[PDB]
């Protein structure tokens, strides 16, 4: 599975969760920013690795990081 | 004379191909004047005006006078451009100015390029030429 790590520069804009095509990320409570929310990845087994979340991330550098790892049927996006 | 080269005058191949001069321009003569000018050059085995880039102040017109001409013109160009870029960064409409040139300022910074090298020397003297290394962005390592 691919590895999605969320770094504490997250401002909780939810843009990465809204852009995930495979429902990997979610907003969880966190007192580390003004928004009160941090992104999280409970479902990285469903991660395909498209890096749409990093495209959507507005922090510099990115608070969300996708590290492509071992390939499974789910991470390869095979419908077969 | 250098490196086994001879003047085009005592070069048989040169005169042979000068006897068959083509006409580059609309001159009735054209090639004749081209060849009588090329005669002063140092030709070779092929009878073609080879160039030496050596300082060699007798044969300095082959590099050095054109070298000075090019450097002066291109440094004029560069200094004019630098002056314009420095002078539009002051206004907050700089990005508009780089696609829509402020033409009076363009001519103003154009006409002062005639003293392009000397001013740069003062900049090299001053420190208003090169930016400090702690004021410019850099990637990690």
């Amino acid at each position: 599975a691919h590895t999605v790590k969320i770094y504490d520069t997250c401002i909780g804009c939810t843009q990465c969760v809204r852009a995930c095509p495979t429902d990997v990320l979610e907003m969880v409570p966190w007192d580390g920013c003004k928004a009160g929310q941090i992104a999280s990845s409970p479902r990285t087994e469903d991660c395909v690795g498209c890096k749409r979340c990093e495209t959507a991330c507005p922090t510099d550098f990115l608070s969300i990081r996708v590290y492509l790892g071992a390939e499974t049927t789910r991470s390869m996006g095979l419908a077969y | 004379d250098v490196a086994g080269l001879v003047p085009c005058k005592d070069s048989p191949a040169f005169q042979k191909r000068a006897a068959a001069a083509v006409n580059t321009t609309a001159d009735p003569a054209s090639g004749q004047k081209r060849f009588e000018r090329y005669s002063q050059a140092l030709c070779g085995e092929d009878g073609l005006p080879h160039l030496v880039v050596d300082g060699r102040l007798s044969r300095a017109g082959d590099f050095l006078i054109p070298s000075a001409l090019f450097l002066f013109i291109t440094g004029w160009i560069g200094w004019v451009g630098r002056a314009y870029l420095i002078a539009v960064r002051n206004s907050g409409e700089a990005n508009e100015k780089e696609i829509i040139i402020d033409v009076p300022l363009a001519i103003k910074c154009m006409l002062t390029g005639f003293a392009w090298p000397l001013a740069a020397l003062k900049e090299l003297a001053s420190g208003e030429l090169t930016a400090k290394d702690n004021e410019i962005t850099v990637s990690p390592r």
Partner: protein, 69 residues
């Protein structure tokens, strides 16, 4: 810092490292990155082919050095 103070960035991962930006806000609450700095050189951020980036980012007080007042 304070709002409107020109500051230099000491964050290496940042696009605006060793560059100045105006402080637009300092968050009074105890968060890790309270300072909003608004630059004029936009970011790389955006899709491929998109003509723009962000000019606003967040930094800590230990990752920001006040050059002016």
């Amino acid at each position: 810092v304070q709002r409107g103070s020109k500051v230099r960035i000491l964050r290496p991962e940042s696009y605006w490292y060793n560059e100045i930006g105006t402080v637009a806000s300092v968050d009074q609450s105890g968060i890790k990155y309270p300072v909003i700095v608004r630059f004029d050189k936009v970011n790389y951020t955006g899709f491929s082919g998109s003509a723009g980036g962000v000019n606003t980012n967040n930094f800590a007080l230990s990752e920001v050095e006040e050059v002016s007042a």
